Amino acid sequence: MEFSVKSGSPEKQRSACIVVGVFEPRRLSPIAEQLDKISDGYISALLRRGELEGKPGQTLLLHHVPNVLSERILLIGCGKERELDERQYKQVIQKTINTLNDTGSMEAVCFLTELHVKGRNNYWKVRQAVETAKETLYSFDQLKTNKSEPRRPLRKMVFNVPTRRELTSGERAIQHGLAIAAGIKAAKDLGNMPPNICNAAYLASQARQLADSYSKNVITRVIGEQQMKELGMHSYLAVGQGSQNESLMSVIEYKGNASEDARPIVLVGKGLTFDSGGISIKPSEGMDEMKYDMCGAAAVYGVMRMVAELQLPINVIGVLAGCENMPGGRAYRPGDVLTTMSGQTVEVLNTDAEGRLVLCDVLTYVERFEPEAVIDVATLTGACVIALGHHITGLMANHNPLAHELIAASEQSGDRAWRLPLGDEYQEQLESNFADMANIGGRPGGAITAGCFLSRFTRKYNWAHLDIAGTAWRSGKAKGATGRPVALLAQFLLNRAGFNGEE
Amino acid sequence: MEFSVKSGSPEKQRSACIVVGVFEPRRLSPIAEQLDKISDGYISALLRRGELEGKPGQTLLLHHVPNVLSERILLIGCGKERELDERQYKQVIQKTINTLNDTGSMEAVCFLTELHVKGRNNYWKVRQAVETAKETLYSFDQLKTNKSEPRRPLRKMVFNVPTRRELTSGERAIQHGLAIAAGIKAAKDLGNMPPNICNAAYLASQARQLADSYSKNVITRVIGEQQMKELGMHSYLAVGQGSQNESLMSVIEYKGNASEDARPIVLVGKGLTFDSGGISIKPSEGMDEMKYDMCGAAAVYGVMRMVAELQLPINVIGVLAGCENMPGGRAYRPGDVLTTMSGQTVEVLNTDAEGRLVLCDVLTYVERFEPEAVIDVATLTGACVIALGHHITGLMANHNPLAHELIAASEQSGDRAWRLPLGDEYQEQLESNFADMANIGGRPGGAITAGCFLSRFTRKYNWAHLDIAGTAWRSGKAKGATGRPVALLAQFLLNRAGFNGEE
Amino acid sequence: MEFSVKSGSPEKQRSACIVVGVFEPRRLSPIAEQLDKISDGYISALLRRGELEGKPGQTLLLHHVPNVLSERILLIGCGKERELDERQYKQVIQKTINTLNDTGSMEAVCFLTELHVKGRNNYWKVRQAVETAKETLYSFDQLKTNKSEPRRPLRKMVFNVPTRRELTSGERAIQHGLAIAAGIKAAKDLGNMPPNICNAAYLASQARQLADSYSKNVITRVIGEQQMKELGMHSYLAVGQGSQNESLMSVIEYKGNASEDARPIVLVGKGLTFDSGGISIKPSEGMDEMKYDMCGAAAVYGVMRMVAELQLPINVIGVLAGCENMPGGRAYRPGDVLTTMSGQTVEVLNTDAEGRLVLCDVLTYVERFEPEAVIDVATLTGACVIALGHHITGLMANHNPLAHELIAASEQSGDRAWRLPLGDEYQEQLESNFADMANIGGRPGGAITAGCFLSRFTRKYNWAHLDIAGTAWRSGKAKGATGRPVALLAQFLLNRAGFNGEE
Ligand SMILES: [Cl-]
Ligand SMILES: [Cl-]
Ligand SMILES: [Zn+2]
Ligand SMILES: [Zn+2]
Ligand SMILES: [Zn+2]
C-alpha cells in the first residue's frame, strides 16, 4: 500500500475513513473531540453508552456520522495518553491496518501518528507506522496452491502530522520506512523459503538480480568452490564438502560515494541454507527451522536492497556466505584440522559449529577491501538464545566506538542488541593440543567463545559480530522469519550517511 | 449470564442489540431482510459497499439504524448457508458473545440459533449455544491478586426460535445446557486448582458441601486410610503411602428413584491430586500439568452436580478417588507385590502406573452397591494421547450395549469417545512370574493393556472405562482443564432418564 | 603468612631470600643489575649460560652469591617489561610463593611489587600480591585423616615500594588485602563443606559466632520456620518443606555509623546448603557440586567478616538465607501456587528454580530496614553459566547508578561482573493463567527472566542481583569454591566508605 503525509483537521477530511484515538476510560482524544463537536456529541454519546472504553485492542466503527465529510470514522483504543510506549503504539497501528481491511475503505487518513510516544519524535512515529503497517500485510503464500489471495481494499494511507513543519520529517520517514520495510520483507522471504529452493545458488541469483536492478551503483561477484580453493579458503570449503550443493560466496558491491578516500563498510552474513549439524548431527525435533540458518545472509541482502533504494552516499559491500552442512561420505568430521585462509589452523571438535568456519575465511577474504569496518551477522549459537532469549541480538566487537554505534542504532530502530564481552579467559577455552585453536569452547560462555573465535580473524580492521540465533525467527504457530536485524543495520547506515533522525 | 427463548421477528425487537447472520459473499440473512426493508436497504447498502463479506470471524456493529426499535444491530459472518457444521456454529456463537461484551449491551436477542446446522435440531442448536457461550465466559482468577474482573455488561441473552412450536424444546435446551455447563465449570475449577490446595481432603470437602446443598437427595461419605486398611484396599493405600496427604475416597450418593429395583449407575473418578510418578519419577518438563491427574474425579463431581440440579429420576453414585503419588522414604516401590481388595495380587513394575492401582480397589469396593453399570473416568495413559490425541476420549468396556450407549452419548453431546479393543493377547502382556498380574504391559498397546488390567476387577458388573488423558486438559499458552467428559456422561444419564432427543 | 612493606635496595637487604625479576630474553631487571654489580656480573654471567630465559614460570635460586648480604637470591621470569597485565602479574607472584616454599626461606623481601602492571598503581600491585599469595596457600584438609600439614617455612614476606612516598599506600593495601583474603577464605570454607555438615543451622551458628567475635558493632538474629510462617514467608517455607533441615534466615547487622541517616546496605545470599532440584529432580552427574548452591550466603558471610575487621564507617546487613531443597512425601510440587510474603502469588513450574522462591520472601522481608541499597548474591541459573561462563558474574538491577557502582567495583577489584538487561518482553515469559506469575520463563533468556522475577519484589528500593552460578566454584580436578564475589562486594563497600583509589 501507499503512504503519504498531510497536515489538516479531521472535520475537513473527505476520506473513506478517518482514524482517531480514544484513551481509557472512554476518553475521546483531542483531535477526535474536534469531530465530536461537528456531529453534536454523537461520538461522545456513543461512548457514554459504553461502545468503546479505550482498552488496547478495542475499536469502534461509525457509519453515516452526523455532519462528517468522511464515510467512516474508525476509533481505536489507545490505553492511556502519554503512558504510551513504542510497543503499544506499534499494536495500535497493527490493529488499525487489520481493522481497516475488514472494511471496504479504499484509502484512509490516520491521526494516530500524532499520539504522544515516550521519547519518540514525529519522524520515528511515522517511520514506525509505515514499518508496522507493512509488517502486518506480510504473508508467505507463494508455495500454497489453495489460497484465493488476501482481502486488501486499503490501497493508500495518509498519516497526519501536527503542522506543516513536520511534513519534511514526515516524508523522510515514509521514504526510509518503505525502504527498510522492503529490506525486511526480502529477508523474511529468503528465510522462509525452504532449503529445497533457497540454496547457495539461489542466493547468488538474487544477488545478480539486485545488481541488474541498480546497475549504476551495484556490482555482484560470485565466488565458487574452485576459486575458494585457489584462495586457500579451506575452512569454508570443508563445511560444504559433504553437501552436493556448491558453496558460493556472493559479494554485492554498492558504490554510493566517489571520493578516492572513501572506505567501505562490509557486511558479512552467514548463509547456511540448511544446517543438519553435519556428522555431529542435530536432533530431529524442530530441525526444519535450520532453513533459517541463512538468515544472516538474508538480512545482509535486505540491507543492500535498502541501501540501493535510498541511494545512500556511502560505500557498502554485503557478502552472502552461501553454504550447506550435510552428513555423508564426503562430509568433514570431528578431528579434522583445517588450514584457514588466514593461515591459522583450526581443529574441528563439532561439525555443527560450522558457521564460524565459514565466516573466518570470509573475514580474512574481505580485508582485500580495506574496509572502514566489518560487521558479521549470523544465526551462530544456541547459547546466545539462552543468554539473551528471542528479544535482543548478541553483539561482540574489537572496537568500542563501533559497538557503541551499533547499540545506539539498535535502540533508535527498536531492533535491539546487547554487548557481550570477549577476553583472554574465554580465548583459552579454545586451546587445542593439535592446532592453533579448536572451533568450540564447551558449554560455558558458548556465545562469547564463538565471538572470540571470530576475533582471531579480524585483527586488521574494526569489527563487530551480531549473533541473531534468537532474534532471526520465531517458532510455534506463528513460525516465521523476522527479518532482523535489517532495521538495526539500516539505522546504522543511515547514521553513517549523516541523516539526523532526531530532528 | 442468563438465557431464555422467544419467537419473534428481528424488526419487532426492542433490545439493546439484535444479532443476525450474513453469509459469504456479503449476503444478508433472510431473517434480516424484513429488518433491512425497514431501514430502507440501510444494511444491504453498507454490505455492497464492503463492510461485511460474511466470512466466519467477521462482524459489523450498527447504531442509529433508520427506524429500528433496537439500539444496536450486530451482524455476524456465518460463511455459506447449509454448509455450517456444529464446530463452525459454535465459533459463531463464541464470536457473538465476545463482540457483544465489547459494547455496552446489557441484554440482546440473537437469531443465530435459527441457522441451519448439519444434523442438529432446534434443541441442539440452543443447547450448544448455551454451553458455548458459558465456555467463553470462563476465567480462573481466584489465585491472582492483580485482576479487576473482566468486562461483562451483557447479563442476558434471548435466543430466537422459528415458531412457538419450538419454544418448549428451546427451554429444555437451556435447562440442560445450564446444568451441564455448570458441571463442566465445577470440573474445570477443580482441575485448574493447584495440588497445593486441591488435595484429597479438598475434594472430600467439596463432596460434603454438594451433599449439603441438596440434602434431600444427596448423601456423601468419606472413607479414609484407617477404613481402607480395614476394607483391605492395599493397592490404593500403597499409591498414597509415600505422600503426607491422606488418601480419601469420597462417595456421593444421589437417589432420585425410590423403586426397590432401581439399580445405581456408579461413576468412579481417578483423583490423583498430584502425580510425580513416585519412585519411577516423571521428567521435569511440564510436570506442573500433573495436577490434572485428578480430572477424572473432577468430571465425576461435575456430573453429580449436574444430576442434582436436574433432579433426574435415576440413581447415581460418584466416587472421587483422591490420592497423591510422591516419591520418598515411605513410597511404594517398583517390585512390590500388592494384595488388592479383590484378593488378586499385583506386581508393581512402574509406580507412575498408579491410577489403575487406586482404581482396581475402588472397582471392587463398588460392587457392594450392586450397580447396574459402572463407569471409571481417568487421565490414565500417555498411550491414549498418542492413540487418539487430545480430541477423542478412549473407551473400553466389558459389555457392548453399555459401550454403545456411551459412544452415542459422546456423539450427541459433542464430547466424543472412540472404542478401543481388549483381548487375551493384550492380557498376556500383563503376565508376571511373581504375582497374579503386573501393573503394566510394555509400550505396545499401553492404553489397551491398562483397560485389560482394570477389567480383571470388573467381572461382576457391566463396566466401561474412559481414558481421558488427552481430552481432560490442554497445554500451551491456553493451558487449562477442559471439563470433559462431563457432557458425555451427562448425556448418558439424560438418556438413561428417558430423554427423547426432543425430535 | 604475614606481609609488610618497606622501601630499600636489594643489595642492603639481609634476608633469607630476596626475590627479583628477569625479563625475556634473559634480561636482568633494573633493580637486579644493582645486585649483579656487587657479586660482579655473577648473575648476568649465569644468564649468559642461559640459566633463565625470563619466561613466565621460570625461576633460578642462587645461594652464596658473592658479596650479597642475603643468603638466597630468587630470580623470576616475568615475560616482557611493561606489557605485563595484572593477570600474568598474579601468576608471577603465585609462582614466587610456591617456589619459596620448597626452600628453607623463613622470610623474604620481594621487589616484584615494583613491576610495571598496566593501569595498576602501587596500592593495587601490593594488594593483588597479598590476595594472590593468600589464595595460593589455600587448602581444605579439615576432613581428611591422612596428611601431615603442608610445608610453609616462609612465615613472612616483605614487599618493596619505590620510595618512602609509597609506604602508606603499601600499608593500606596490605590491610585491605588481608581482610578481603580472609573473607574470601571464609566463603571458600563454607562453600567447600559438605551438605552433611554445612546446613542452615551451621550457617546460623557461624553468623552467631561472628556477632560474638565483634559484639561491639555486630548483632545476629536467626529467623526460624515458625517465625517465617508468622511473617507470611510461605514461598521460602515451601522450598524447605520437603527437607528435614529447618529453614533458617540468619541476619547479621553491622553498625559502623552512628548517624540517624546512615541507611543500610543490605546483602542477601541464597543459602541452599544442598539442591537436589526437588521433585523436578536434577541429574546424577556432578550433583555433589550442588553443595555450592549456598555460595551466595558464603560470600555475604565473608564480606561481613571483612567489614567487621576493617571497621568501615557504614551500615551493612548481611542475610544468609539457609534452606535445603529435597524431594520427598512433603516436598512442594510443580503446579503449586504460593502466596509470597509480598502477597503476590507465584505458580511453581519447576522446583529446581527454588532459589528465587527463597529470595523473593527475603527481599520483601528486608524492606523493613529501609535500605539505601539491596544486593542479592546467588548461584541462580545454569543459563548464566551458559551466557557468561565461569569468568564473569551476571549482574541485573533496577537502578543504574547502583549497577555502575557495582560494575566499577568489579573491575577495580579484579572480580568482574557484566550487566544483562531486564525488560517487558522478558517479564512476559513469566505469565501464568493461574497466578500473578510463574517461577520460570523457559529456556530463552533464563538468567534474565530469573532477574525479572526477583525484580517484582524489589520495587521499594534500589536493587541489584548478582548471579554467580558460574563464578562461585570450579569443577574438574581442581574442584573447589572460589569465594567470588567477595572481592567485588568488599570493593563496593570500600568505595561507599570513602575509599580513595590512592591517586
Ligand atoms: Cl553421500
Ligand atoms: Cl520423606
Ligand atoms: Zn551448525
Ligand atoms: Zn549453523
Ligand atoms: Zn502416574
Ligand SMILES: [Zn+2]
Ligand atoms: Zn496418574
Ligand SMILES: [Zn+2]
Ligand atoms: Zn535449584
Ligand SMILES: [Zn+2]
Ligand atoms: Zn538452587
